[PDB]
Design a protein around this ligand. Structure first.
Ligand SMILES: Cc1cc2nc3c(=O)[nH]c(=O)nc-3n(C[C@H](O)[C@H](O)[C@H](O)COP(=O)(O)O)c2cc1C
Ligand SMILES: Cc1cc2nc3c(=O)[nH]c(=O)nc-3n(C[C@H](O)[C@H](O)[C@H](O)COP(=O)(O)O)c2cc1C
Ligand SMILES: Cc1cc2nc3c(=O)[nH]c(=O)nc-3n(C[C@H](O)[C@H](O)[C@H](O)COP(=O)(O)O)c2cc1C
Ligand SMILES: Cc1cc2nc3c(=O)[nH]c(=O)nc-3n(C[C@H](O)[C@H](O)[C@H](O)COP(=O)(O)O)c2cc1C
Lengths: 184, 184, 184, 184
């Protein structure tokens, strides 16, 4: 039976390593899994309750409905200052205020890429804490931290070339698929 | 000898309880301490490395220089989804990329206000982790979590009326003043 | 279909409020749920790989199987120094080293109690980070933080008296029960 | 002016890599710094308020005064289950209950070692949260995470061999020394 995962990207720069990792997921997705990207978090305005009462920003509603109708979400993000990038958290913040709230009961897998060796590990646990509050089911195993990403995605092609990393993510995706089927 | 603290506000809505708490600090500041607000984090664009290379946004540079020349910073913010509001973290993110980086060696005190009983405690530790990376010296004691804030700031005047809360913050400010003098 | 939960207690003192809360769970468990206590974490020696090479202590293996054969685990602990009590973390440390590891795939609900306003919340999230590594499924909703436990447990009888708190714990158990059934 | 640091060790096994790292510190300490070990955390019984009412165990009071009279403390610990080892947290628990509490105002540097890529980083931040409550000053920079410690300690002699790692630890000590002098 087919499944549909959507990806939420936490960096906005064109040469983003995390963007490259994210773009490789539809190509990597195992059989019975289709993966499409969500809109950019950059079209979102800063969360404000004054702006929310004037009406929810359109791209917020679009992402929410895309998340709600998907079987799982894969969040692919860098780590900024030992935590999650504000831009990404601002998106999570908009989604949390949406009714009904899209991440409740939603299987989610985390992927972080970094040039350093920690591979964005610190952000993941900060992100998990937020996701607890929204009642998402976040994949425990396996965890995907991609350190030393520069030697794993080639520049000017901005493609995830590393076969080992590619295989690793493909098995994470399978583990997320087992999770969404366990809760269905 | 006089001291100068600047305040960074984490909510953007007019009726923000945290804004009310922040506005009460110059009035509450003990003798030998002057407190001024910083610019809004809402004028900041989302952090992007592509935008940074085109030049630092003006209000980012203004806030950085205001932070660098101050004796301490007081961050007054709500808690969003068990963490720090993305908008605020986006600001921290911009400041981290500034050279020289304004929060290094900077005494900082945290204040959180919330209608619930936890009083924004969860955000504070997430924020502390980010501040470690930027080498800020964050006040350990006393901690300021204002739960049940609705009964402590009156509506339509948006003023921190609570005398007990006011006194508490005034002694926190004194504790931050002792910290900035210990490291000078 | 009946279910069997086990409780893990994080405090060692006779007059523990968290213990009173734990003792109340068998009595509060809804229809179709039986809840039994685990052994004291106080019989465990400090974790050491040297003590492990010579063999797992009997009470560690006992707790491991009781956890394994149970449908869910309920952890009831105070908060020590903004984190989890070392003695309780020590028990978690012992269990994690057991093969096969008992908490893998194990539905878990957390309950924390404190005389303070925070109600042991800081401990719950630190504990959640450890439980991710052990691939346990920790109940996201509802969360049980019991603040001001002092006026919620009758003294000299050490019984959980607050009915509102009591019915609350029963709603969590039903949710934990729902989680265990979703993962079977 | 001379300074005296004490080391707190988080592992109990004879062949501990973190122990080897701790043993190297007196030898690596720059001019004007003397570093002595504290007693084993393994002599401490599990924390209990009942065991405390009958009196603080002698080795807890011993560690407390050694910490008190020392200019700084260096904590060297592995990471257990994405957090701090229970046995080490247990020692922290005992110390926090001592009056006067030894870590108040105490300059502290953290060092963690792991065979893995993460180098015990997750433990450091959990530990930082506890240390905020105890009003210790934890060195922000530089941070010492020793990953792949296996190829950095000579086997059969259990000595810290990596010179790059060794000089690194000496740069932290100088920074810890600078912090202790800024707060005198
Ligand atoms: C403001 C800022 C904060 C950062 N913080 C961290 C960090 O805390 N830990 C880390 O390993 N890398 C950190 N980095 C580096 C990023 O991991 C690296 O720039 C990465 O390539 C950015 O992600 P991207 O390529 O998808 O844009 C930070 C970078 C920036 C610009
Ligand atoms: C998106 C969002 C997330 C929130 N998350 C939390 C939370 O995690 N914990 C909490 O106590 N309150 C939370 N709140 C409630 C705020 O604490 C409350 O709205 C507060 O008044 C907002 O701060 P302000 O008054 O300064 O704007 C959240 C509110 C919003 C809109
Ligand atoms: C070593 C120690 C650390 C503590 N740390 C905290 C804490 O971080 N936060 C808190 O709210 N209470 C803290 N407490 C207070 C406990 O919540 C209180 O002792 C509680 O009654 C203990 O739980 P119990 O009754 O089940 O033994 C601490 C107590 C001790 C002895
Ligand atoms: C119970 C237990 C939990 C562990 N948890 C982690 C962990 O979370 N992260 C990690 O990188 N290593 C973990 N390890 C592996 C240790 O880093 C490894 O055993 C290390 O050599 C122990 O430090 P030591 O040599 O000083 O005793 C764990 C080991 C044990 C026994």
């Amino acid at each position: 039976s087919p499944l549909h995962f959507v990806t939420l990207l936490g960096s906005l720069r064109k040469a983003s390593f995390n963007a490259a990792v994210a773009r490789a997921l539809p190509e990597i997705a195992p059989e019975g899994i289709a993966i499409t990207p969500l809109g950019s978090i950059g079209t979102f305005p800063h969360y404000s309750q004054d702006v929310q009462e004037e009406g929810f920003p359109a791209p917020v509603l679009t992402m929410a409905q895309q998340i709600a109708t998907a079987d799982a979400v894969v969040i692919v993000t860098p780590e900024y200052n030992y935590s999650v990038p504000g831009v990404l958290k601002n998106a999570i913040d908009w989604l949390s205020a949406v009714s009904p709230q899209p991440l409740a009961g939603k299987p989610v897998a985390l992927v972080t890429a970094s040039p350093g060796m920690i591979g964005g590990a610190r952000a993941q646990y900060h992100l998990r804490q937020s996701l607890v509050f929204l009642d998402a089911y976040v994949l425990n195993r396996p965890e995907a931290m991609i350190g030393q990403v520069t030697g794993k995605v080639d520049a000017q092609t901005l493609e995830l070339s590393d076969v080992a990393t590619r295989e690793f993510l493909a098995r994470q995706l399978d583990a997320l698929a087992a999770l969404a089927r366990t809760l269905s």
